[PDB]
Amino acid sequence: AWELTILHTNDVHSRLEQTSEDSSKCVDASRCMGGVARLFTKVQQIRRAEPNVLLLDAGDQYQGTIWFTVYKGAEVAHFMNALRYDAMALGNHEFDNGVEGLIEPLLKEAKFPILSANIKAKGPLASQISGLYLPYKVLPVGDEVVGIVGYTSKETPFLSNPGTNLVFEDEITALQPEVDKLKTLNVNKIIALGHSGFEMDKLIAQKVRGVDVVVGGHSNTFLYTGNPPSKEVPAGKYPFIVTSDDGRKVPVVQAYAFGKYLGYLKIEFDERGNVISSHGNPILLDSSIPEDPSIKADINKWRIKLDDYSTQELGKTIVYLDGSSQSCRFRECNMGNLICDAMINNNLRHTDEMFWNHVSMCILNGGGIRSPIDERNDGTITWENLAAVLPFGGTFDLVQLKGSTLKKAFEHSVHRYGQSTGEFLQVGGIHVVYDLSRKPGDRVVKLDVLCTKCRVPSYDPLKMDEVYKVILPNFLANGGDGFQMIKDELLRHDSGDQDINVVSTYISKMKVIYPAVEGRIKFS
């Protein structure tokens, strides 16, 4: 009975330090979770009990908190070396700072293999990057060998900044030949480790012959078998079992995000690489598991550089600024309302006497709100708090749109509602009412907008023919999140201030904030 124990994180997103249960900054240490020091402790506990253990990361360590803004990746390489990871697949956000943002910080410093089989470099890059990332890696595990093939999101050119000298092929098309090569090398146990979302994960397990396990990410999927230990709601059992086209039962696993859970899968292999059985569950890394002192001290040695971003208090908040995905991708959220009001507050300028201000409206992709902010620490908001909410460093731009163009974006906002996708829109100066029973593209039942050509701002139904000015993220003006209609049909695009400075300025102007949910978005 050859047993393998796969440990896997994904979408850790720079939460090196322990976090609150909402993955925001750790306020009350007696209830905090995650961290790489607590992960070390738990990983060790298992490497002692089990002889055959592999530790894998399925992408998206980059971006999320002030840890990445400063060290820009070097912190990721250091503490993944300290955790002695056995392999890592590349995610889209690993290209957030371009290829150069990945080679010098991460690739050149990792002491473990970094994998991606559907990325191929060309031109000046093929010599600069050759050998720094592999399509697969055959790892020794005891007296056997396990092959691990990497894959990265086909859509990463649209999601990030890979550059024009990197081609991203269809995952299944590129993975299949690499798996066949490993089989011809007499490797009968093969793991697919990648970053394309749960739905592609299930397709890779169904169509790629010879994949025994798929360990994925990118969709922050929580799977659990039984009664779950925390707030996260499971999308299915752990592992999710896929029956391949050639007749095999192929487990598919993922461990949410933000370092909260450690995926734990046990696989019973026969002598020929057949999977007899698979069982496990993600392990909640709560306060019961102590942080390893040696890693924690190295954390604090690196933590002294970051305390320069929590020195200055920008303002206070007396409400919970709910920027969780469970809210801002499903309903109106007060962090969404906060961010939009500050966007409108920044574009206030004198104009014609037949107007009160040139722009009265705001839209904001919920997926762009990347973290909540707790108020129980005497409500203080520092730059560190804001850098977790708006980590990407985009801008807040002025656009101009036709009533019909806006109507299509709000139909798109809910065209696949229910899957926790980022395109759900938070709004300002807009009152939208949805009806999901109606068919996609015909679910905006009401859409009223705040008038600009009026001495008293008031709400008036959207007119398709009219033309409106909107403050939106740079991410959306360029067609992000599937908002092609915006990128195509806009009548004007003026660039604006930094998204983090716009929100830093408006919180100091107000000194104390209490944004509410007031019906800007409603459901029939």
Place this chain on the structure above:
Amino acid sequence: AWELTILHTNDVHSRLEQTSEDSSKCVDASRCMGGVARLFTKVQQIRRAEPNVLLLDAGDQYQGTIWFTVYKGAEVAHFMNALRYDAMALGNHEFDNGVEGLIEPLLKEAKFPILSANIKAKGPLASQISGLYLPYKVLPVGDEVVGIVGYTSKETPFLSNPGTNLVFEDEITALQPEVDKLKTLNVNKIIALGHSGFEMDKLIAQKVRGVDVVVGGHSNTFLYTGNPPSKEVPAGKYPFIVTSDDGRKVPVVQAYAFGKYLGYLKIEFDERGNVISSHGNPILLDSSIPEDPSIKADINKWRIKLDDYSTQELGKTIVYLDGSSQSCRFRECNMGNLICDAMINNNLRHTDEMFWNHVSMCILNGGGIRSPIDERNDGTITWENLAAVLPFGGTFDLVQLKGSTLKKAFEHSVHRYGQSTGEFLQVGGIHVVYDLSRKPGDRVVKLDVLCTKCRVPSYDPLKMDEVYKVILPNFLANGGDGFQMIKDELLRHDSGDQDINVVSTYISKMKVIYPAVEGRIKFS
């Protein structure tokens, strides 16, 4: 043909200077209206054409602008003397500063008779005030005599500060004997000049025998015959004709408010005091009528004391702050939301950790918003502008009421909707929906309120059993405007800051304001 011309103002409310068409502070002088200097000119033009002319005031010169805050009445005595008024009835706001606030400034300095027949003093006051105001006055007009009887609102003890040494009798009960007294003195032409509202004016004209004309006020009633000259909508023809119980046609007149119009009524009397005919109309005092230089110079001589209230700029506004009665007494108006938003912003104090703040709601009687604020002066907001919006100097108190108490107050808010009454409520942290088709007391179809025991403020239907904290004017906690349920059923009443300082502070904190109409109040 003995003809009499009655000129009458009413509810001037301290608008000594010329004003904007909304009666707010005069921005662009080439379009401004009213003023005592422009009234003078028009009065003169008529005294030259007609030999028999009476100029009357039907009450409520006190309170309304910074002129009254500073000079406290002396400006009324002075500039009513300079226009040589022939008589003045006492209004409710004439007692806003108590009896002594009426005796020393106006009564002792008026060179015209000040009339009120239904007010009788008692105790220590009856010798201090005897002869400073009369129930009637028989004035010579050419070779005839006209009797003028004063009356003041029966409700003045609830509306103002008359004191316990003044009794207010039923108008009709008190006027009849005085009118009978004048008849026995062979006075066959008798005018009723008083301050009880258009509805009582019509009743005084119907039930008091021997009254030939009723010249009233207090309800800012606009009457016009034909096509009106400005925004004001007429409530009826000018004069409104009442058929008395004893068979006479009795004209009843009123001239809006704020000095915008000069009432102009011509009456044809026969030899025995019968009314042969009555016709006229209010005269719009617009820019075509020049301001009298001599009054304007005396106006400017007095204006130097007041310019210390426009020196300091508290903030700016880029929207029209609509504090007009036609908006703020019928529908949501953005001046109401502003005042309520500042009330909630002021009662922010740390509380139990299972709350975001103790108070989330606000109610505000629309009639307490006493002036709009124009923004075309590059929107500067000074103290002078605010003292016109909140002239009374009340406070904003914290009260505690049962859901049923509040449900009753909002049924009262619209229980006689449509007559421009002050009890219509402006709100904050509350979403109310009315249905006027339904019967009074059964017109609040929806009532949602902003939660306090919640880390994310959101709106939840009113629960009758629950208990809520509300910020409301001191005027409402005490049962004003007919909100008895609050005074009776409140579980707590703590006094707060000045109504004018709360709104001055919140306008500086924000630096630039743009309050909108956002659906806090809606109509089925």
